[PDB]
Structure formats: structure tokens, C-alpha cells
Swiss-Prot record:
This is Endothiapepsin. It comes from Cryphonectria parasitica (Chestnut blight fungus). GO terms for molecular function: aspartic-type endopeptidase activity. The chain holds residues 90 to 419 of 419 of the full protein. The keyword Disulfide bond applies. Keywords: Aspartyl protease, Disulfide bond, Hydrolase, Protease, Signal, Zymogen. The active site is at D35, S199. It catalyses: Hydrolysis of proteins with specificity similar to that of pepsin A, prefers hydrophobic residues at P1 and P1', but does not cleave 14-Ala-|-Leu-15 in the B chain of insulin or Z-Glu-Tyr. Clots milk. GO terms for biological process: proteolysis.
Length: 330
């Protein structure tokens, strides 16, 4: 089997991407944030505290003939941005772009933090990291990909995120028309439950490539590119007027400046992030100060190849017995 679904930016800045997902019988379609940095499929629901729902589409298990309470199961998650949610668990039929899993754990939110409430466009998350990070207790549950894997033509999914445009998540096949050149594959460590890999270095604009190992995660659920402070400083030093603002909480730059590209290494290959991808617009409406899309990972404790980086590539998440990551230009 295979599946193919279009993923759409939630706003004009590509702050996140939503993908339609069918849950239950008859289908209830929710727009979920596909997140390769976490491993819970959770949704706004009929059980979510009313004051914490503000425009989202909810899953109502009682209206699904295939929904079954996973008795005694609870879940609770906190994300790197300080957001959180928690609740109980059902199993139900879940389909993504034609690909169907029966008995998928669908984690029903009883509580969500303000960040989620305030984002009317995201109805929940669909985690695509390794199932070892799944928070369901007492019995850890498998991700949608893990459950689908054996049925897939090939045990892979791919992320092809658009710049200010829709893109595609595919399951079970590699669309050879979707990228240029070849796909370069690189080793993955699953020891922390992430799609963790080591970039071979970087360049800033037309500058010479610096060979240096950068360990980080491929995370579709994180907006920006978070790299070591040395790397980030070298980038913004090439932008006139750029500075790190403690009050804003990262690097900002005058919107009149031109941003250089940023290149990162995948083995001997190179992915180029165009300068425009690194512009996340005014810090506040009407401001001439713009927020940068490359920020320091210092104090996160891990480097994150988020959407800024990933949307410059066609990315293969290979869930073969020994997982790997593939990157191609497009």
C-alpha cells in the first residue's frame, strides 16, 4: 500500500503545516500537524475542556462506530516550545491520503495549553518520530507510520514541504519526479527516539564550505533552523544590521537587508536554503525589525533541522531495519 497527502502552510510565514487526516467511521477529517520530532497522535476532541477549544475541529469518539476506549490509558506531553496537552486514548481507524491503519491509538485531549487553543488552524498532531517516545501509559502505543510500515510497498515516508506553498507527505514510495539529482542517504541514530543525523558542515551565501560535524534532528514539527551559536553567529554576521535581541529572544534584522543563502552538508552533497526562506517577517505588525529563521540551539540541548531547512529539500525518512535519512535538492 501507499498513501499521499497534501500538506498546507497554516499562514503566510510557513509557521507550520497541516495535513488532512480521516479518523473514525464515518470519517471525521481533522487537520493535523505532522511532526517527525514527536510520537503521539493526539486530537482536539469532544472531551477537550470547552474553554480551551477556539475554532478547532474536534474528534467525537462516540460518533465513530469503530472507536474503542483504550481502557486505563492516559497520555501527557510537553513540547520544546513549552506547550503541552494530555488526556485519554481510543483506538480507531485512521487514514492519510488513501493509506488506512486500523486500531491506531488516537489520543483524545482533555487539556491543551494556551498555545494550542490560540491556533485555530491545528486540530492536533500526528507524530512520526520513533514509537519509543510515545507517551501513552501504561502501554506505549505505536505511531501511524510504525503501524502502517509492514503493509507499505517500501517502509518509508517522505516530506516535501513547500516554501509559501503546499507540499506533500508520501507513505510507502519515493516519487522520483519530486526532486532533482540524486538522494544522498545518511546514518540515523535512534538512541534519543528522533531522526537524528550528522550534517557534514555549512556555508553562508557564496562563502567557502566549513567541514564540521553538526549532530541534529530532522523535525517537521519545528518551524525554524536551530544550530550551534558559532554557526548562527557566522550567518548573521553577513547580514547588515542583524543583531541578537534578548527582548525578542533571538536574531533579528532590518527588513531592508538581503539575506544570504545557507548551505548544509549531507555527506558529500549540499542542500541550499535560499535567503528568502530565512525571513519570518516583522517581529510585530508594522515593525521594520524582522525575525530570523536561523537561531541558536544553545540551551535547547540539541540542534534542530526544522522546516526552514527541510523545505529546501526532498526528505526521505527510511524506516528500514536500520533507519536512514535521505536528502535531495528539488
Amino acid at each position: 500500500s501507499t498513501g499521499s497527502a497534501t500538506t498546507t502552510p497554516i499562514d503566510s510565514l510557513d509557521d507550520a503545516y497541516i495535513t488532512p487526516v480521516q479518523i473514525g467511521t464515518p470519517a471525521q477529517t481533522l487537520n493535523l500537524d505532522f511532526d517527525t520530532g514527536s510520537s503521539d497522535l493526539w486530537v482536539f476532541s469532544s472531551e477537550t475542556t470547552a474553554s480551551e477549544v477556539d475554532g478547532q475541529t474536534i474528534y467525537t469518539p462516540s460518533k465513530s462506530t469503530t472507536a474503542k476506549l483504550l481502557s486505563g490509558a492516559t497520555w501527557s506531553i510537553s513540547y520544546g516550545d513549552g506547550s503541552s496537552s494530555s488526556g485519554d486514548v481510543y483506538t480507531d481507524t485512521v487514514s492519510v491520503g488513501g493509506l488506512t491503519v486500523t486500531g491506531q491509538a488516537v489520543e483524545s485531549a482533555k487539556k491543551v495549553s494556551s498555545s494550542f487553543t490560540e491556533d485555530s488552524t491545528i486540530d492536533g498532531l500526528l507524530g512520526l518520530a520513533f514509537s519509543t517516545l510515545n507517551t501513552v501509559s501504561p502501554t506505549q502505543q505505536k505511531t501511524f507510520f510504525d503501524n502502517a510500515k509492514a503493509s507499505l510497498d517500501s517502509p518509508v515516508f517522505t516530506a516535501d514541504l513547500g516554501y509559501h506553498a503546499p507540499g506533500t507527505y508520501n507513505f510507502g514510495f519515493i516519487d522520483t519526479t519530486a526532486y532533482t539529482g540524486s538522494i544522498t542517504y545518511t546514518a540515523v541514530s535512534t538512541k534519543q527516539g528522533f531522526w537524528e543525523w550528522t550534517s557534514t558542515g555549512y556555508a553562508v551565501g557564496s562563502g567557502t564550505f566549513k567541514s564540521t560535524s553538526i549532530d541534529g534532528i530532522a523535525d517537521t514539527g519545528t518551524t525554524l533552523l536551530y544550530l550551534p551559536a558559532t554557526v548562527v553567529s557566522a550567518y548573521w554576521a553577513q547580514v547588515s544590521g542583524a543583531k541578537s535581541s534578548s527582548s525578542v529572544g533571538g536574531y533579528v534584522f532590518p527588513c531592508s537587508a538581503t539575506l544570504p543563502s545557507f548551505t548544509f552538508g549531507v555527506g558529500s552533497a549540499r542542500i541550499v536554503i535560499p535567503g528568502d526562506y530565512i525571513d519570518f517577517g516583522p517581529i510585530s505588525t508594522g515593525s521594520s525589525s524582522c525575525f530570523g529563521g536561523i537561531q541558536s540551539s544553545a540551551g535547547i540541548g540539541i540542534n534542530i533541522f526544522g522546516d526552514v531547512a527541510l523545505k529546501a529539500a526532498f526528505v526521505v525518512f527510511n524506516g528500514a531495519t536500520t533507519p536512514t535519512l535521505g536528502f535531495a535538492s528539488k
